[PDB]
Amino acid sequence: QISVRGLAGVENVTELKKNFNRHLHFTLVKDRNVATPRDYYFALAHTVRDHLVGRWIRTQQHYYEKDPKRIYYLSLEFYMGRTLQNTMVNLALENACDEATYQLGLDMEELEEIEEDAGLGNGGLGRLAACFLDSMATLGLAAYGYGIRYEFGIFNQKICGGWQMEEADDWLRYGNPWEKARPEFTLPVHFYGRVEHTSQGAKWVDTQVVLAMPYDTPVPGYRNNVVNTMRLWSAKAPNDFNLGGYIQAVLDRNLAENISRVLYPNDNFFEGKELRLKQEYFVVAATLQDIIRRFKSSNFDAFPDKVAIQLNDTHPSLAIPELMRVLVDLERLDWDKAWEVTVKTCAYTNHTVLPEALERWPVHLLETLLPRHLQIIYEINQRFLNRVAAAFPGDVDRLRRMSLVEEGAVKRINMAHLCIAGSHAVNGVARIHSEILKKTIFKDFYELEPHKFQNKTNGITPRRWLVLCNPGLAEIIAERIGEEYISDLDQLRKLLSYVDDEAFIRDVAKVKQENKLKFAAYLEREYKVHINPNSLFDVQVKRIHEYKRQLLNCLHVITLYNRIKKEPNKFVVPRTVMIGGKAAPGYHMAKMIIKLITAIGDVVNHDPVVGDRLRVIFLENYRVSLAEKVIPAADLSEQISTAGTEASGTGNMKFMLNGALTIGTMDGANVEMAEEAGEENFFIFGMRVEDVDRLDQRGYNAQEYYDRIPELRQIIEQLSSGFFSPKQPDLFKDIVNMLMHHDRFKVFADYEEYVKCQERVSALYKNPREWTRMVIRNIATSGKFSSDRTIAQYAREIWGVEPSRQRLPA
Amino acid sequence: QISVRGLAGVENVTELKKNFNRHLHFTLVKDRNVATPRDYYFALAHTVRDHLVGRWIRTQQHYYEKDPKRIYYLSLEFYMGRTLQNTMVNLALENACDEATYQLGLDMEELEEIEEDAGLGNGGLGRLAACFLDSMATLGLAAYGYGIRYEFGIFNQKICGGWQMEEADDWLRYGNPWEKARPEFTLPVHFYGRVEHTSQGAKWVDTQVVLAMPYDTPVPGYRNNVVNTMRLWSAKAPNDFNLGGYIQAVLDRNLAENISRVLYPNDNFFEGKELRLKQEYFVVAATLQDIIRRFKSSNFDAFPDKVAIQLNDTHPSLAIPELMRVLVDLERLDWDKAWEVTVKTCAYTNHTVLPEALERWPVHLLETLLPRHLQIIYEINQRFLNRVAAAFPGDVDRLRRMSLVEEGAVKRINMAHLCIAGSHAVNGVARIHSEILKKTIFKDFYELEPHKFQNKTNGITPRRWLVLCNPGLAEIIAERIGEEYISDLDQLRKLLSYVDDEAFIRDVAKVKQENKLKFAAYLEREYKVHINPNSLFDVQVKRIHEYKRQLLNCLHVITLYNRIKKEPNKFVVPRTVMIGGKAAPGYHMAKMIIKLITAIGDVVNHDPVVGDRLRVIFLENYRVSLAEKVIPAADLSEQISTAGTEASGTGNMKFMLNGALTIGTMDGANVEMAEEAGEENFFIFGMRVEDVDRLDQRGYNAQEYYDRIPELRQIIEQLSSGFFSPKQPDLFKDIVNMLMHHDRFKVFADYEEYVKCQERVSALYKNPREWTRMVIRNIATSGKFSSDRTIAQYAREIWGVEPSRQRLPA
Ligand SMILES: O=C(/C=C/c1ccc(-c2ccccc2)cc1)N[C@@H]1O[C@H](CO)[C@@H](O)[C@H](O)[C@H]1O
Ligand SMILES: O=C(/C=C/c1ccc(-c2ccccc2)cc1)N[C@@H]1O[C@H](CO)[C@@H](O)[C@H](O)[C@H]1O
């Protein structure tokens, strides 16, 4: 049908058809009288997977022969979503499979909806890891992603009575056709025990053993025949473990296997729980044995020429002392040589500045669980502080500020300090964030070792986030400029020379309109909710946090409703305001915010005076597959974190590539997006970081804003008095109380400017031609935000390897 | 190579070769530079499995069209062993696969050794269920086996320092290529809760839900293209289950899933544990919903014309009140109609007379776990006792003896009484056992309803237990009489006309000798133990229990050793005495017996005066795959249970078919085996049941035997004084104490007769020609003990269906 979806050759279609039927018969053990749509999904997935395996085997054989430097990307999260369509896109099989399935009497899009998301992440950090694997394969890098195969990923969110309920994401129930278990590469991981000192060094003894069993998933590059590996570890008990007496010993195997059972869902709070520490060590210990095994199967001097380890946040920070443990205790290298190798091998990426998100593990936990690692960490700390003392003699406060060990009620290890000390490179994830790291939280470290600190601005993969989710847009672009932009996104700049082309203008606008009609239909079908597709689609989707300021959005919504009720017969640009995202199960304020959003909906959506001029919908169970549907349909992207709090953002980039305009603060990557597009083509408002700092020095007093802005006061009274919760008038007192007396994120301070900026958005939307021309200018300048650019910078400036765009042979 | 292994056609071999390579590449994702023998095993298994699926689908389609009466065989145990070779045998593929693998440079026998046993049973009862599925498929019956998919089967036994150690049988670690998960047929099972009475009957409410997920395994008939199904249920938690708070609720899913985690290993003790009761209900509740679903998908009057349920012991006895619950509570049939349907549908097989093996569940357990079932059981009991009262008025002791409810300290339900009341047929498993049921333990029930009581003498499948494990023997037989005996074992009688044929005599003896050389080699390779293959192979393999009298065997062994030490230069027929079997983890005396056997070995095997005239070996980890190796190699089968204690035995039959002579008591099926072969061709000794009864009336006094038999006294002194345990002289005091003062199984009373009978065995073994002629007479009369005869009798006399030997089309 559409050109970017590839060829539908007679030979190809015929062969796909017979392989589909083979799998249905031999693999699924069904015939067509009993097969359900789920059976048909699986037959398709196995058919497509078969096309991967030859390339997968020859890619890994290629790396064995050429022995390139290998990149190991360590992450506790890989937020992959669905795999079927992505695989078809990257292998150029989408149209052939569409034809083959059509001829079998089946609708491929319907089969695609059956696949479960691989929801092995919380949000931004997890999805970045996924985008990165796609780009590393596409750029021909010999890269491996290593993590944990959680039996249960991020919980499925149900809304009951306006409240979030969590249920288990049993994503493996029907089986996962993409993974291959590799029980033959199982490895032991040690916990607890104690340290003995001998003449021939330290020995870690009397440990409990848990086994790490790997499962490999293929990661295909875009049409280059490269297929890389994501290896996820699963926890297994040894067979003499514990060995009711007998029955109970068998049942207690669960204790060990609980390590890989569930993803921690609390993504900007740190909870120092033992089970999470076990997960962190488990991934690190198994991965490093795997790395070393592969290195020996080609003298540790050359280890950093053959190995790069990238730490995604501090979550795998124990790689540093584990590498030291292996090198010193097992391989018998002297300390200084081992340290040199470790530093040259490891690099650390930081993803936040909020102090409550930093990992600080209690010493008593490490002491019991990982006694040898604690000793190594103390030794690292001592030698590190000796260097600080020599560089800044007499500066005793610097010594206590830079220490890896934090003193206090409970002593803790600062894992961020450990990562800086033991890495040759440290990067933030957007320019403003990387500057903040150097100026504030890691200032002392930057003065000691300025050469370590870098920026690598985040990106997204244009395969999933344009070709896959928005084929209509990818096609009209391809018509004008060809297909090469899909792996070289900077070529979208050529679209500037069509900003005055009346045909293109009409087509960009038509694609958006079709995407919106499609999504409005999805809403009615799967959620019995009825929206006006001529309204402006105003969308804020991301995890629920106070710093992301969903509450500021809420205040605007209520202002609109109040203005309509005041002058009901005045014209306003109609809006559908959509907000979605998950709240961490323990985060009370985030749960109250969800309830507020649904409560506003209850009032606004049933007020006959409003009509269909304003609708407020809470988008349930936001996740990767829902993002792929809502983002192509959006007109306005809400990116409104308090300046200095969102390290980068990546949702922002998705919306820009897909033809929405952005209203946002000068925070994270928003700054670079506005710089690329031009500030005239962005709806920027609010305090900059400098303004927030000045307000903090003075003291933030929310009462001042309440006293001087009558529209704001009216909303606060409505919240307080039970306007949005008639049967429980005090339901939202916690929210009011927070806003009035302890708002760390200064919601009121940006209110006026935000409401004014929103009026300008509405004004532009009334002129469809100029809206669409501004959109073209955004899409055209979105090229910098491809993850291929990001990974190319990691490769050259951190890992010391050259990317390659050349096909491997098929 | 050998004819019974089928054709090796050029077309077949070529096609197997390419399918093997396909699976290695696409299924296992390997190439031949990295493949291990385990990879090659899996490629073979998938290749053979492909040949099943077409027949499996068309068999089940055939049953849908013809709608025959369906047989449901309910068992908590299915002791299947390995599947690969059995599948090849039954499909006539063994020689083709042997050729195909040879041409690929691989040894098929070596690949066969990689497969794990499916050890989902303890011993006799579990293996009977397995033999039965094979025979039901071979006889064209529309039969389904239903049980539990235990994650851990019977423990692997290691011997450390002469002691049994148990380790977990993690049989699914590498995956099971034979099963197909069917998550789409998942069913809810209810526990706990309470009963509400309404106007419209009782309702069971506030229950906890566990999900039952089925896994289907194919059961192929012998060369008839029938493939039946064994459906095993796996326990899964629902996704709102419980829903740390969040983390802990996810981890607590283990509680529900523990139902299918592990097989109870205690096979002639009853332990009233809650987890076992959950297993019993779980299998019954899921199975019955499945049965009813299938019945509706063609008025419950016709239910018993379309459904037979066979209860393998009392373990699935809750089928009776569950069927009543469904019919009365959910389908709204009146009680009397429901009861009629239930009785006509269910039949019960009893497997023992030992009182400590009978299931008697505490009322308080049923009360909490299954409150509605308890009510139904009380109601059944009340109506049943009203019938007893009417038939035997005034007989008040009969009323208390026959009651399903046992009074006492704790009230219990007698599940055997429940099964008799609710079944139209009750059978024992050998003639003597079935007579004992009528005369003693179920006398009262037989007087009330004599028509219910039947005999069905056990059997074994000649596919696994001759063709598969002893191809050499199957071939020399086939040469003389053709192949038809494999599915009509009575044809072995034709071998009587070769008892004087000198060629046949030499061939029978040569096959035994080759089997023995092969096993002696297996011993050295896998266990560093060196035996003389010219000795008589004296074998006792079965679970370790006092009633099976491994101790009597021990006493004989020590007598032989003592006679040699007394007259060392006298000639004796050399022996290798092999004893093997698992002890239940809690059964202290059984564990002491294993230690005694190894201790005797320690002394006997290293005494230079004995030389290689006597060896005592404990066969470690006895299980189905080990039986297949040792049984073909045996000369003498030890079947020496105290008369009246072994209900049937089936090991006995295996040895008879494979060319060993039997020394045994007149117990279980030994009686019928001697009757078939002729008592002159059997080494019978010891008390009969009548003699045991007379001794009990008088009072068994072991001291009398010790006082009158000097050779026995010497052994007891040796045990007592530390002869077999020098460093711990009192190690075996418990054993001596038991033998002298509370031996329920009268070991001393059969000692003299046993030792004398053993001398006659030795005398015959000195004349190789006459030994072999007696063997021929055993093999020739083993036909009655085919499980095809057994199942044909169940089919006609219990289930009301005709067996069929006709091929389905391929
Ligand atoms: O998603 C995250 C952080 C997730 C996270 C997840 C888990 C944990 C955690 C740590 C310890 C124990 C339990 C949970 C801590 C943090 N950060 C986002 O990373 C994106 C990619 O760089 C940025 O675009 C966002 O600005 C940043 O907030
Ligand atoms: O194997 C068994 C009994 C096994 C068994 C297994 C499990 C349990 C059990 C029951 C409740 C709770 C836990 C365990 C009770 C008994 N019996 C043998 O059955 C054979 C087949 O009929 C006969 O040949 C043997 O004579 C008989 O002992």
CA count, 13 A, side-chain hemisphere, B789: 19
Q: Both B451 and B557 in a single domain?
A: no
CA distance B651 to B633: 14
Burial A221-258 (b: 16+ CB within 10 A, else e): bbbbbbbbbbbbbbbbbbbebbbeebbebbbebbebbb
Pocket of ligand 1 (CB under 6 A): A 122-125, 128, 264, 266-268, 270-271, 276, 315, 351-352, 357, 359, 429, 458, 646-650, 668
Give me the domain span that covers residue B737: 460-786
The single residue listed with the structure tokens 């304003």 is A614
CA distance B509 to B437: 41
SS3 labels along A176-219:
CCCCEECHHHCEEEEECCEEEEECCEEEEECCEEEEEEEEEEEE
DSSP, collapsed to helix, strand or coil, labels residue A671 as helix
Ligand-binding annotation for B31, yes or no, is: yes
Q: Which residues of A touch B245 (CB under 8 A)?
A: 585-586
Q: Both A446 and A492 in a single domain?
A: no
Residue A183 forms contact with B (CB below 8 Å): yes
Straight-line distance from the first to the last Cα atom of chain A, in angstroms, rounded to the nearest whole number: 25
Among B29, B49, B163, most A C-beta atoms within 10 A, so best to mutate, is B29
Cβ neighbours for A66, distance < 8 A, ≥ 6 positions apart: none
Rounded to a whole number, what is the distance in Å from the CA of A314 to chain B's nearest CA?
22
* Cα-based angle B41, B45, B51 (whole degrees, multiple of 5): 155
Q: Both B529 and B413 in a single domain?
A: no
Ligand-binding annotation for A306, yes or no, is: no
Structure tokens that stand for B776 in this block: 């021929």
Helices (H) and strands (E) counted in chain B, each on its own, are 33, 25
Q: Both A516 and A387 in a single domain?
A: no
Distance (Å) from CA B266 to ligand 2 centroid:
9
Q: Hey, how many other C-beta atoms are within 10 angstroms of the C-beta on B199?
A: 4
CA distance B606 to B599: 11
Give residue B400's identity as a one-letter amino acid code.
Answer: R
Give residue A266's identity as a one-letter amino acid code.
Answer: N
The torsion defined by the Cα of B808, B21, A229 and A70, in degrees rounded to 10, comes to 170
Closest residue on chain A to B274 (Cα): A244
Number of domains in chain B: 2
Closest CA to A575 of A540, A542, A524, A544: A540
Closest CA to B507 of B805, B174, B261, B776: B776
Contact yes or no for B409/B363 (Cβ under 8 A)? no
Q: Both B391 and B493 in a single domain?
A: no
Closest CA to A236 of A343, A151, A154, A297: A151
Contact yes or no for A775/A508 (Cβ under 8 A)? yes
How many residues does the structure list for chain B? 810
Q: Which residues of A touch B183 (CB under 8 A)?
A: 173-175
> What is the crossing angle of helices A94-103 and A37-66, to 10°?
150
Domain CATH code at residue B553: 3.40.50.2000
- Dihedral sign (CA A104, A106, A108, A111): negative
Structure tokens that stand for A494 in this block: 């050529």
DSSP B239: T
Structure tokens that stand for B539 in this block: 């074998």
Contact A273 B247 (CB under 8 A): yes
Resolution (A): 2.0
Structure tokens that stand for A606 in this block: 């049933």
Residue pairs between chains A and B whose CB atoms are closer than 8 Å: 105
DSSP A739: H
The method of structure determination was: X-ray
Closest CA to B604 of B567, B562, B646, B571: B562
CA distance B480 to A485: 78
Kindly report the protein residue whose alpha carbon is nearest to atom 11 of ligand 1: A270
Q: Is B161 left (phi over 0), alpha (psi -120 to 50) or beta?
A: left
Q: Both A284 and A427 in a single domain?
A: yes
CA distance A176 to A46: 10
B302 burial class (0-12, 13-18, 19+ CB within 10 angstroms)?
exposed
Closest CA to B450 of B465, B466, B439: B439
Ligand-binding annotation for B786, yes or no, is: no
Q: Which residues of B touch A184 (CB under 8 A)?
A: 36, 38
Closest CA to B182 of A177, A117, A30: A30
Q: Both A378 and A429 in a single domain?
A: yes
DSSP A666: S
Rounded to a whole number, what is the distance in Å from the CA of B260 to chain A's nearest CA?
10
Which ligand 1 atom is at minimum distance from the Cα of A458? 22
Structure tokens that stand for B326 in this block: 């469904």
Which H or E element spans position B136? helix B124-138
CA count, 13 A, side-chain hemisphere, A48: 30
Pocket of ligand 2 (CB under 6 A): B 122-125, 128, 264, 266-268, 270-271, 276, 315, 351-352, 357, 359, 429, 458, 646-650, 668
DSSP, collapsed to helix, strand or coil, labels residue B96 as helix
- Give Cα separations from A155 to A76, A159, A167, A280, B126 (angstroms): 16, 13, 5, 20, 41
DSSP, collapsed to helix, strand or coil, labels residue B72 as strand
Closest residue on chain B to A155 (Cα): B246
The single residue listed with the structure tokens 């018993």 is B304
Closest CA to A317 of A355, A372, A360: A360
Among A19, A24, A28, A29, most B C-beta atoms within 10 A, so best to mutate, is A29
Q: Is B381 left (phi over 0), alpha (psi -120 to 50) or beta?
A: alpha
Contact yes or no for B276/B313 (Cβ under 8 A)? no
Q: Both A503 and A396 in a single domain?
A: no
Q: Both B503 and B619 in a single domain?
A: yes
Contact yes or no for A1/A108 (Cβ under 8 A)? no
Straight-line distance from the first to the last Cα atom of chain B, in angstroms, rounded to the nearest whole number: 25
DSSP A646: -
Q: Both B237 and B158 in a single domain?
A: yes
Q: Both A21 and A120 in a single domain?
A: yes
Structure tokens that stand for A18 in this block: 């017979």
Q: Both A641 and A663 in a single domain?
A: yes
DSSP A786: B
Q: Hey, how many other C-beta atoms are within 10 angstroms of the C-beta on B519?
A: 20
Q: Hey, how many other C-beta atoms are within 10 angstroms of the C-beta on A596?
A: 22
Q: Which residues of A touch B261 (CB under 8 A)?
A: 250-251
